Design a binder for these strands. Structure first.
Length: 306
RNA sequence: UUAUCUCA
């Protein structure tokens, strides 16, 4: 069902998808030339600690800003108000409800640097927490960005930007047919040594786009084919915003898509919905969103008047 | 609490 939703969305939204290989590669080059890959290493590590504090968060956000400055594919703060227009009044009700659903789903001791030894000893025979003053500051700092994935694969893997691009393109083609997985990645590593860098055993949840993952690599590979009607390459603007939501609603109806309740499962529908509604101006899947403040349900509001 | 891990 998941991949079916994904594919129905792709076909429906194909008109809003664009060719962005060029930009993504241009942006990767910018990062390769301008970014401090020494600090990239540090932030990678800092993000992997189980106890993470404000000093680590500040480190992450600073790096994010550095990256925001080198890249052209950004999302900008753009509040959206949805009104009865190309959107029906029933549609506003669905959206207003589903945004609420998203909101609602969102609603271990004192040591130390000895957690490192706890780990080793435990292994001898990994939930990660934040200790932060204001947790708003985590919002939008943890996303994945193709141009960044490319850059890090390239410097850290010590290969040509091109070798990375070709490898990820293969992931991208597979992705048009199925959700690539660990075995597929392993079979692809023969022809593409660079993919050894994506270690799926060592990858994890909420550790930022500076660390590698199969999911992030697939997101990147999607931007490598100038076609495929990949959702990743969708651009949103204030004009095109309603048309996109309406097209999504049409698929939602047709396939009976919905927002899950189980906190762990995040599906094609809630993914595209949260991503679109975060800002009415950017590339919802693949841009630099570190500048954005707030969540989708705050940045997009429904207006039942009429 | 992080728009992210892994999975059909």
């Amino acid at each position: 069902k998941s991949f079916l939703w994904t594919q129905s969305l792709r076909r429906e939204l194909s008109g809003y998808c664009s060719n962005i290989k060029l930009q993504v590669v241009k942006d990767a080059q910018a990062l390769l030339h301008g970014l401090d890959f020494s600090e990239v290493s540090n932030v990678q590590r800092l993000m992997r600690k189980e106890r993470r504090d404000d000093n680590d968060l500040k480190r992450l956000r600073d790096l994010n800003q550095a990256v925001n400055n080198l890249v052209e594919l950004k999302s900008t703060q753009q509040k959206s108000i949805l009104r009865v227009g190309t959107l029906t009044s029933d549609d506003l009700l669905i959206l207003a409800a589903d945004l609420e659903k998203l909101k609602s789903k969102v609603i271990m001791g004192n040591l130390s640097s000895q957690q490192l030894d706890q780990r080793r000893a435990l292994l001898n025979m990994v939930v990660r927490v934040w200790d932060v003053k204001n947790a708003e500051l985590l919002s939008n700092q943890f996303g994945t960005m193709p141009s960044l994935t490319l850059a890090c694969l390239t410097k850290q893997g010590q290969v040509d930007l091109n070798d990375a691009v070709q490898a990820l393109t293969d992931l991208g083609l597979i992705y048009t047919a199925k959700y690539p997985n660990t075995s597929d990645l392993d079979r692809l590593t023969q022809s593409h040594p660079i993919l050894n860098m994506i270690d799926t055993k060592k990858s994890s949840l909420n550790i930022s786009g500076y660390n590698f993952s199969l999911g992030a690599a697939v997101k990147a590979g999607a931007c490598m084919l100038d076609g495929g009607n990949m959702l990743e390459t969708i651009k949103v603007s204030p004009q095109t915003m309603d048309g996109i939501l309406k097209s999504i609603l049409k698929v939602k109806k047709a396939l009976g898509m919905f927002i899950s309740d189980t906190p762990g499962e995040r599906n094609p529908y809630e993914n595209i919905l949260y991503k679109i509604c975060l800002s009415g101006d950017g590339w919802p899947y693949i841009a630099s969103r570190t500048s954005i403040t707030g969540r989708a349900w705050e940045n997009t509001v429904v207006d039942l008047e009429s």
